[PDB]
Each structure stands twice: as structure tokens, then as C-alpha cells.
Amino acid sequence: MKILGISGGMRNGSNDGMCIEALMGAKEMGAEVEFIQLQNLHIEHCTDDFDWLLDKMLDADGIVFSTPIFEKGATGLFHTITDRFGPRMDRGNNIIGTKIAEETGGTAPDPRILKDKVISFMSVGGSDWVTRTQCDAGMLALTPMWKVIDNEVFPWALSILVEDERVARAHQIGRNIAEAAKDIEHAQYQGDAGVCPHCHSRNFHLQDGKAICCLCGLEGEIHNEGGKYSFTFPAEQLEHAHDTLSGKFIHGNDIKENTGKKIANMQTEKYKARQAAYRAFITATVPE
């Protein structure tokens, strides 16, 4: 079993340490380990070393990703990696694509891409402003439907490398990812049970008559049973959940239909006239 550790913090900072401590626990379980420090990489925003990074992640049986917390969420770079997983790693599209390829004599895309995989996350912050990072982390796994093992948040963690019990927790997380990768099929989630019984998320978008889980997108109802929160949903919503094949197939077909509508709409005179007036009204300002 091959475990990859990734750190999005500063070189030789706390995320590196927690990540490496997780790698140590993974080796204790018998894993070969590798470490990638993202500050050594050049990665552009979704409109360069990304393909290299992706190849490394695809060669790993399990992944431990440690990210700083920026504004109560993961770093911009973590969000960029998530943006850029979209067109290459979506499990629905990759199943569709290799099916069309096999049936039309096309070229079989990369086998590694559809391989099952386990991943764990650690979010390390300076304070208690930490309420969005675990959902950001889940977002990265959601696209390829990698199986999350741990998804841990460390608040008040500037001095975490002298906090022995919290370092021991990174070590255990590394043991977990290693065991999980031994038998990916029977690997089991080890994290907080959360509120969403399906997602494990604690993040919700709330409107009248509809509570939406911010990770998996199930639409249902939030209950306050004396301060304890719970989340229910009609079972049929499971077909639409954003982290299932069924939900991804639906989502992708909606994108295809709506993209087709747009291409045709771009031919209309209404579209062309409005666009021409935008171009004539103003020119974009750029730095000299």
C-alpha cells in the first residue's frame, strides 16, 4: 500500500509536520510513503504542475492531505485544486467516457482514473474560525467519489507541534489511512458522525421548507430536538445526492442539455445584439 502525504502549509510548518507524522503512522502500518509540499509546485487558477500532482495522486492507494485554514475554510490553492479536479476526475464522466471509448473503438482513457481510492484530510488553523474547512475538504473527494476516512479540524493550532495529544491524533489518522488502503472495499469512515447521515457534514444552507446539505446536496429538513440537530430527507433524494453515481449522471445530463441550449442561444440575434452592445459600451481596464 502506497500512501501519499500532501501539505498545503508553509515549508517546514505545522501542516508539514502533521502530514509527516501521519506518514509515520502509515509506515508503522507497513505503507510505503511519499510527501509532496505544495509550495514547491506551480499551479495556476482554473480559468501547470497540476498534471504532475494528479499523476502522483493517481498512483497512490491512499492520501493524507493537510491544509491550513484561511477565512474558515481551506486555502485558495486547495479550492483551485478542487476546481481543476472537475474536468478530469469526475467519476460519472469517466465511467461514461470509458464506456463510449470501449464501444466506439476509442482509446481507453487512464485505468488509474476510475480506481477506487481512500483519502483523509486534516485542517489546521490558528483560531476557532474553522466552520467551513471540513466541507471544503469533502468537496475535493466528492468529485471522484474517493472514500473519506478521516476529516479532522485542528483549531488554535499555531503551537500544535508541541501539543503531544494532537500530534498523536495525526499519527492515528495515518494509521487509519494505511489500514483503509489495505482493503479499500471494506474500508470504513472513521470521522465525526456529523448531522447529515449520508454526507456526515455539519454545513447546511437553510430556506423555508428546505434544508440543503452543503456537501452532498440532499434536500430535506433540519430538526432541533432540544439543542441537538438532526437531518431527515425523503429517501428518493438519495438518487440525486451529489456524491453518488446516480446523482452525478443526472447532474451531467442537465449540464449537457443546458450546454446545448446555450450553443443555440449564442446564435440568436438577441444574444448577438446584447453582446455587441456590451463590447461597445466599455473596454476592460488592464495594468500598464
Ligand SMILES: Cc1cc2nc3c(=O)[nH]c(=O)nc-3n(C[C@H](O)[C@H](O)[C@H](O)COP(=O)(O)O)c2cc1C
Ligand atoms: C490569510 C490567512 C487567513 C487565515 N485564516 C484563518 C482562519 O480563518 N481560521 C484560523 O484558525 N486560522 C486562520 N489562519 C491561520 C492559518 O491557518 C495558519 O497560519 C496555518 O495553519 C499555519 O500553518 P503552517 O504552519 O503549515 O503554514 C489564516 C492565516 C492566513 C495567512
